[PDB]
Structure formats: C-alpha cells, structure tokens
Design a protein around this ligand. Sequence first.
Ligand SMILES: NC(=[NH2+])c1cc2cccnc2s1
Ligand SMILES: [Ca+2]
Ligand SMILES: [Mg+2]
Length: 223
Amino acid sequence: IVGGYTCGANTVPYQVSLNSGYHFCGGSLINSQWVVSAAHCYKSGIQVRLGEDNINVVEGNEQFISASKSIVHPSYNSNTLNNDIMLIKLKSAASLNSRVASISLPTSCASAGTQCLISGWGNTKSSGTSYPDVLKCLKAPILSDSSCKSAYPGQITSNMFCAGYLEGGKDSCQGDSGGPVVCSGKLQGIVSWGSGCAQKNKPGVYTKVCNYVSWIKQTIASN
Ligand SMILES: NC(=[NH2+])c1cc2cccnc2s1
Ligand SMILES: [Ca+2]
Ligand SMILES: [Mg+2]
C-alpha cells in the first residue's frame, strides 16, 4: 500500500496473510472455514495466517491454519487476469473473536464514488521497494468505468473495476495482491493488478466480487 497509513493491530479482523514460508498474498475470511483471494496468488502449500498485525512477530492473536483445498475460478485467464478469484478452504475452522472475524459478501455491486478500505502488507514505495511488517490501510473511491477503461484500453472486462486516485500517490501494490476492498461493510473487490504503483492515470484494478457471489456460495456449500 503506497500513501496509506498503519491500520492498527487487528482493526481489519477479516484480513488474512497467505504464507508459503513467507507472506506472498493477502486474502479475506468469509466464514470460519473459507478464504477468498486472487487466483494469480495460487500456490500449492499455503498456510493461512489469521489475527496478524506484524507478520514477523507472534504477538499473541494469530491462528495459523493450513489449507485443505484451493479452487481457482473455472474461467480464470492468467494472461488477461479476467476472473481473478480463488477460494481456499481451511483444514480446521478458525475461532472467530474480536480480532478474527469474517467479512460479508455483497447483495449488489457498489457505485462509482463509493469509498472503500484497501489493506495489505505490500510494497509502500512507488519508485522503490520497502515492505512493511504491520498492516497498512488506504481509503479510496471506486472510479467510473470510463476512467478505468481509458487508463487501460482493451484490458478491462465487466469483472473488474478501478479504485484509487488518477493523480497518483495512493494505491495498492505488489504484496497486496488477493487482499480486500471493503465498501459499506461488504467485500466488493480483491487486489488484482495495475501498472506500477501510485502512478498518475494508472489506478489499481480489482476483481468485482459482486459478480461471483452465486459461484462462491455454491462452491463452498459443495466442498
Ligand atoms: N494497484 C496496483 N498498482 C497494483 C499493481 C500490482 C502489480 C502486481 C500485483 N498487484 C498489484 S496491485
Ligand atoms: Ca504476528
Ligand atoms: Mg492484502
């Protein structure tokens, strides 16, 4: 997250860190046994870490659970990143408490102009690399689809939306992939891609979760 702030320990209780010996992607807890992340974060051997704030210090509120199965969307295209969403089932159910909570799925899609909260442990520099140990947050609005499409011609599909600031300065970045975009208490997006980070006229692109609620509900009920 570039141009963001320190969230504060466990202020984003649904945020998860996917670890394969090191943190490589974020995700969101949707219920005690399931996590949603980005399909491009797929790896074999994932351990999900819940209740984290500093990912390099065991502070007492973490739950480390291995994944039993991962399901990448049937139509994920790694070349275009269309349908960049995946579900991860935990080996054991997590224990929900104040610090570990799940986030709700949307009933409808959010409108351009809606402010959201984006969080992650990704890079904090636009031209440079500095990875933080604690969770960073960024409040950003959903942008109109025309500003999204003019920034990325021929690359935006109806399963993606842009959020951020066209002036640059504030944005999600590498290491934030798979993490949450929560607007009005619902999970509306997943950090997916972009061009550099916090550059002018290159906002971040997010998977549009409201288009996958049926697939999510159906898949978790049958697995
Ligand atoms: N919001 C951005 N500028 C992002 C760029 C990338 C690049 C790779 C992975 N994730 C992201 S997010
Ligand atoms: Ca920790
Ligand atoms: Mg994240």
